[PDB]
Amino acid sequence: INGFDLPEGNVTQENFVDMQQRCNASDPAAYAQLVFQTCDINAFLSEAVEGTGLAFIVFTEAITKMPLSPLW
């Protein structure tokens, strides 16, 4: 959206790939400048750690993104 000043809410988790292709077609040079990150849930799922890391690095951070955070 920033790279091609597209209207916010037009690109979505579903039409992202097609919009990406259209934008590259419209301006390959500008698109070439754009840098994207690989989005794979398996990657974050594989981030599962054993030992204190699972609680102090994985459970403590999931709790901060939860309402009534301190209680939990």
Binding site: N2, D5, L6, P7, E8, G9, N10
Partner: protein, 719 residues
């Protein structure tokens, strides 16, 4: 048949039109050579008799068949008279269109601007603004004149232009044409000759093709001019960018002719100037015309009519009698031929005398044709003949042959290069301008450009085709193209392209038929009756046969060509390619004069508010400009201890996108040349960002300034 009855009426109509036309021309002649309210009505009533006669005779021609007519001789005359014209419009609509045209002409003629500091003295375009746009070397004065004329006159002329295009399109559609652009291009249309046909659409393509052969030489001229202008205005022009539009020697950039003092290849030595030599010879109007007549008759063309020599207006009356000194040619008819122009003692007077004599000789060479057939092949031949005559009459060997310019004088190439570049700055610097303006008008009439993207497309085409960038961003409140004479006053502009190509085609053909050996630009025509005969062949044709045929009668080619023009400047082209060996030949359509002090803004309404988020219209842009003006006012009051009245008109916005993103900069209240540096605008936004944010219900992440990041977040909860 019918064809018989058609020619019957046409022959009668020819007699009925010729006599009354002569009376009208005689009356107009008298008034133009006698500014007396009394004769003003005299020519008027005659012109009125000429106009009513017109309408009635067309009504008479209506019943006469068109396609049924086979004899193209008569068919052409009928088609010329068959034009229903604007009358196709409703009465109320006709009155509305007439008042719109009058209003636009009056706004252009009587509009005026004046200084922000002394608003008592106001300058009109004709004298004050034009002089600034030609003589001044000051960036601030030129920017003020350019922007102020655009603001006042274009903002007045925009809605009239919208109504004008709607009404003219309606009339053209009701008159069995596609659009108004089609009506204008219908002048070139030729049909029913089976081999010399020329469709109205085809012309567009041809024009485009021709421009493909100009881009190269012109880009080199542009690059050369850019380097010179960079010296005339250091720290204002990017060597890889377009030329600012207010530095091109006049108001619009139609001609670069006023850059010569600053773009002279060899300023060391001046060009040929015999005005003094003419004064030493004490040559007078009669002489200039007589020596001119010698050159014109020197090639077997008829001698100038004695009538002209008896009833002409060569010298300024200056005897309680006042006449417009503008050079012209009157073809009253039945052997009555005249030329009216004030005669000084100058080279330009000599060349204008040759130009007008070429005009009148062309006009009188085909007096045998009917009254409706007594015109040029199209809108480019008439001026092309005069242009080639003047060009042939200005050769240095011609000056050597008329008694001055003593033979013990050698002409070097440096002065020749100077002359070639002076010619280039007028001839080649206008072709992109003409092409782009006619392209924009054609696409505006065609409906290709919506009514909310006229200025966007205007400036996009101007950056892309001409390589000229606006110094201040213009929104759709403006009508910059309507600020020209030809646009507001409803005049066609493609004549200046075809005329420029036809003149050079004719010059090359005739000067080749004159058995030259040297370069084209140094060649002459005199003593070449063969060249004169070829020209005369098309001259006498008038509009009796197709223009494509008439052009072939001289150049041997049915269509227009850029090659002859490119050859006329091969010398300068080589020199320019050498001079631009280091210089970046070309331009980039992203650099703007104001782009180095702009701030970009990105707004995310759907994130901060999610649901129940307001729509973003021009009223939100008004509020945003007011907020930025408030911010700048507060910064200047609370830090610099100065009270400055910034407004929403000082906040200039460009490049608006659906992302709700755009650029802006700020100027001083009554000074478009004063731009507040970004650093001060960043400091002002830093000071007032909380108020600017809470005015829009956004909080420092849905309203970002791309250069300004928040830093004050210090927490002290757990001590």
């Amino acid at each position: 048949t019918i064809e018989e009855q058609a020619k019957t009426f046409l022959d009668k109509f020819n007699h009925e039109a010729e006599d009354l036309f002569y009376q009208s021309s005689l009356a107009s002649w008298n008034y133009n050579t006698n500014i007396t309210e009394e004769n003003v009505q005299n020519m008027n009533n005659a012109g009125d008799k000429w106009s009513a006669f017109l309408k009635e005779q067309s009504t008479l021609a209506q019943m006469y068949p068109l396609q049924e007519i086979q004899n193209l001789t008569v068919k052409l005359q009928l088609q010329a008279l068959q034009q229903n014209g604007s009358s196709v419009l409703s009465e109320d609509k006709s009155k509305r269109l007439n008042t719109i045209l009058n209003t636009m002409s009056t706004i252009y003629s009587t509009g005026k601007v004046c200084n922000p500091d002394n608003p008592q003295e106001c300058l009109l375009l004709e004298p004050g603004l034009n002089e600034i746009m030609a003589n001044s070397l000051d960036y601030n004065e030129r920017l003020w004149a350019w922007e102020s004329w655009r603001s006042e006159v274009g903002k007045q002329l925009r809605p009239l232009y919208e109504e004008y295009v709607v009404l003219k399109n309606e009339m053209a559609r009701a008159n069995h044409y596609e659009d108004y652009g089609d009506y204008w291009r219908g002048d070139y249309e030729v049909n029913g000759v089976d081999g010399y046909d020329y469709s109205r659409g085809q012309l567009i393509e041809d024009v485009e093709h021709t421009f493909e052969e100009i881009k190269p030489l012109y880009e080199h001229l542009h690059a050369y001019v850019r380097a010179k202008l960079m010296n005339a205005y250091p720290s204002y022009i990017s060597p890889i960018g377009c030329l600012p539009a207010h530095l091109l020697g006049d108001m619009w950039g139609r001609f670069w002719t006023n850059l010569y003092s600053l773009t002279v290849p060899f300023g060391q030595k001046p060009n040929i100037d015999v005005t003094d030599a003419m004064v030493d010879q004490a040559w007078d109007a009669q002489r200039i015309f007589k020596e001119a007549e010698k050159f014109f008759v020197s090639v077997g063309l008829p001698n100038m009519t004695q009538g002209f020599w008896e009833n002409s207006m060569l010298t300024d009356p200056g005897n309680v009698q006042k006449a417009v000194c503008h050079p012209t040619a009157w073809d009253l008819g039945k052997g009555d031929f005249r030329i009216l122009m004030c005669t000084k003692v100058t080279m330009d007077d000599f060349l204008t005398a040759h130009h007008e004599m070429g005009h009148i000789q062309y006009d009188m060479a085909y007096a045998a044709q009917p009254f409706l057939l007594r015109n040029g092949a199209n809108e480019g031949f008439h001026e092309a003949v005069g242009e080639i005559m003047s060009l042939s009459a200005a050769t240095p060997k011609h000056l050597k042959s008329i008694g001055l310019l003593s033979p013990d004088f050698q002409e070097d190439n440096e002065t020749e290069i100077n002359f070639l570049l002076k010619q280039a700055l007028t001839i080649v610097g206008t072709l992109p301008f003409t092409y782009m303006l006619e392209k924009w008008r054609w696409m505006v009439f065609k409906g290709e450009i919506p009514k909310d993207q006229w200025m966007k497309k205007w400036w996009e085409m101007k950056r892309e085709i001409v390589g000229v960038v606006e110094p201040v961003p213009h929104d759709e409140t403006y009508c910059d193209p309507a600020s020209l004479f030809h646009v507001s006053n409803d005049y066609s502009f493609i004549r200046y392209y075809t005329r420029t190509l036809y003149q050079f085609q004719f010059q090359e053909a005739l000067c080749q038929a004159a058995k030259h050996e040297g370069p084209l630009h140094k060649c002459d025509i005199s003593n070449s009756t063969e060249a004169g005969q070829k020209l005369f062949n098309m001259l006498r044709l008038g509009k009796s046969e197709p223009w494509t045929l008439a052009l072939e009668n001289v150049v041997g080619a049915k269509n227009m060509n850029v090659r002859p023009l490119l050859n006329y400047f091969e010398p300068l082209f080589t020199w320019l390619k050498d001079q631009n060996k280091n210089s970046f030949v070309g331009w980039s359509t992203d650099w703007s004069p104001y782009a180095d002090q702009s701030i970009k803004v990105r707004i995310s309404l759907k994130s901060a508010l999610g649901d129940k988020a307001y729509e973003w219209n021009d009223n939100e842009m008004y509020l945003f400009r007011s907020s930025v003006a408030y911010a700048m006012r507060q910064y200047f009051l609370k830090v610099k201890n100065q009270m400055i009245l910034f407004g929403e008109e000082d906040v200039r916005v460009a490049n608006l996108k659906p992302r709700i993103s755009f650029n802006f900069f700020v100027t001083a209240p009554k000074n478009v040349s004063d731009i507040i540096p970004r650093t001060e605008v960043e400091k002002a936004i830093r000071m007032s960002r909380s108020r600017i944010n809470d005015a829009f219900r956004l909080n420092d992440n849905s309203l970002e300034f791309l250069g300004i990041q928040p830093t004050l977040g210090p927490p002290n909860q757990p001590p």
